[PDB]
Design a protein around this ligand. Structure first.
Ligand SMILES: Nc1ncnc2c1ncn2[C@@H]1O[C@H](COP(=O)(O)OP(=O)(O)NP(=O)(O)O)[C@@H](O)[C@H]1O
Ligand SMILES: [Mg+2]
Length: 427
RNA sequence: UGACAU
């Protein structure tokens, strides 16, 4: 599978964004916690951030006029050469918070690219937990570095290895990857970490949990990796449990911690709604909710890949043109599904947790948790697919006491923190 | 369970 080439249409490159919403200016009022030694002062605006002219021009081309809180803090921190753990709610601009200052530094303090005997030595490694998120960050990096000499490349599974490998072999300043395909190329001597200036873990708490930690260790402790005191390490997420924050410390050097509001809190721009249903009732309740919301774009989350295929078939055999995305689908199908949803061709996407984190989709009207997740953090990520950049969103969650009772204390906390209604069955 | 190379 060779994915469709990245669009070189400038308009399309900068169009890939969610226009800021009615509550964007309200971001200003959120309390920001900063801890660690000698934090730089936050920047007041993109124009007063000591950026290079055409990096600023690209920010402005992207449609941005005012930096979000995470950006106000992260930009000067990164430009000062410091390590950073950055926490901010879903849809509040964490991607640009690291891309903009990194790209600025790659241009203001330029280093010639190295690629010897086919082995690329990227200056920036960005990793994320899923293939579609990795492609998204890649496309955002292309946006902010547009028209510059910087070369961005992508690496992720389910794709023709040679296609991605030959592209990487040409040399790249920034490599955005999922861990599996990254280490594949590293072990073939297609990629070395010898020129790394920045390592970024996006969805960092997920990258540091049990599933991904070995792959992170293999990167951070790779024989070719430049040591932690001679590079920068940046970590961003909407969630960060304290035990995972502790684990993060092994890969960080005298770092600053930035939390925009309560760590792991839900975006207050998402209206959170719950419906008490039995496992049986879920099917009709989903059908009813879709009928009542004709013309709305809905993202339906389920627990298993089996149920993702079932629900997709149910909603298709019923009414709407619907797509499905999960790990047992072909990578072409996963990308076609997401694009169909992102373009408007399809207004329903059925998804597993593969689509819970990071993905930036225009006008998600409703996020439905057909199955609630087992983790409150993942709940917060899922509902954050809507209500982004100051726009209002809606999440409707099906609650089954037989399956979801253990989550009640954590849900009630999340709702109370976000000033949402707590229904009687979650008290 | 669900992500994550060949
Ligand atoms: N300063 C800004 N002004 C206007 N729009 C912005 C700004 N910064 C980012 N955006 C847009 O806001 C959307 C959300 O950005 P993104 O970096 O995906 O948020 P995030 O905090 O990483 N979300 P998540 O990964 O779900 O926790 C994107 O469409 C950006 O293009
Ligand atoms: Mg993000």
């Amino acid at each position: 599978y060779v994915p469709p080439e990245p669009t070189n249409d400038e308009t399309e490159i900068f169009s890939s964004t969610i226009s800021s919403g009615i509550n964007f200016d309200k971001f200003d009022h959120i309390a920001v916690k900063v801890s660690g030694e000698n934090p730089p002062r936050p920047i007041e605006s993109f124009e007063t951030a000591n950026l290079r002219k055409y990096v600023l021009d690209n920010v402005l081309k992207a449609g941005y006029r005012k930096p979000t809180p995470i950006q106000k803090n992260a930009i000067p921190i990164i430009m000062s050469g410091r390590d950073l753990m950055g926490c901010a709610q879903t849809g509040s601009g964490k991607t640009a918070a690291f891309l903009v200052p990194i790209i600025n530094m790659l241009l203001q303090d330029p280093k010639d690219l190295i690629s010897e005997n086919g082995c690329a030595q990227p200056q920036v490694i960005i990793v994320s937990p899923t293939r579609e998120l990795t492609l998204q960050i890649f496309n955002e990096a292309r946006k902010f570095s547009y028209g510059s000499v910087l070369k961005v490349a992508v690496a992720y599974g389910g794709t023709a290895v040679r296609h991605q490998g030959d592209n990487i072999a040409r040399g790249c300043h920034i490599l955005v990857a999922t861990p599996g395909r990254l280490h594949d190329f590293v072990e073939r001597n297609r990629v070395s970490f010898g020129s790394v200036r920045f390592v970024v873990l996006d969805q960092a708490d997920c990258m540091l949990d049990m599933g991904f930690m070995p792959s992170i260790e293999k990167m951070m402790l790779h024989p070719t990796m430049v040591e932690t005191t001679k590079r920068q390490t940046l970590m961003f997420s909407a969630t960060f449990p304290e035990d995972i924050q502790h684990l993060a410390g092994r890969f960080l050097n005298n770092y600053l911690f930035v939390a925009v509001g309560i760590v792991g809190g839900a975006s207050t721009d998402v209206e959170q709604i719950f419906i008490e249903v039995t496992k049986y009732e879920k099917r009709n309740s989903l059908k009813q909710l879709i009928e009542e919301n004709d013309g709305k774009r809905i993202l339906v989350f389920v627990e298993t890949k089996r149920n993702a295929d079932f629900i997709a078939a149910m909603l298709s055999e019923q009414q709407l043109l619907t797509s499905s995305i999960h790990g047992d689908r072909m990578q072409r199908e996963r990308e076609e599904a997401l694009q169909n949803f992102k373009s408007g061709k399809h207004c329903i996407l059925v998804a597993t947790a593969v689509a819970a984190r990071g993905l930036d989709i225009k006008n998600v009207d409703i996020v439905v948790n057909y199955d609630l997740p087992k983790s409150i953090d993942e709940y917060v990520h899922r509902i954050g697919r809507t209500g982004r950049v100051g726009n209002r969103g809606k999440a409707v969650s099906f609650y089954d006491s037989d399956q979801d009772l253990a989550l009640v204390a954590d849900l009630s906390k999340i709702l109370r923190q976000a000033d949402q209604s707590v229904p009687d069955f979650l008290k």
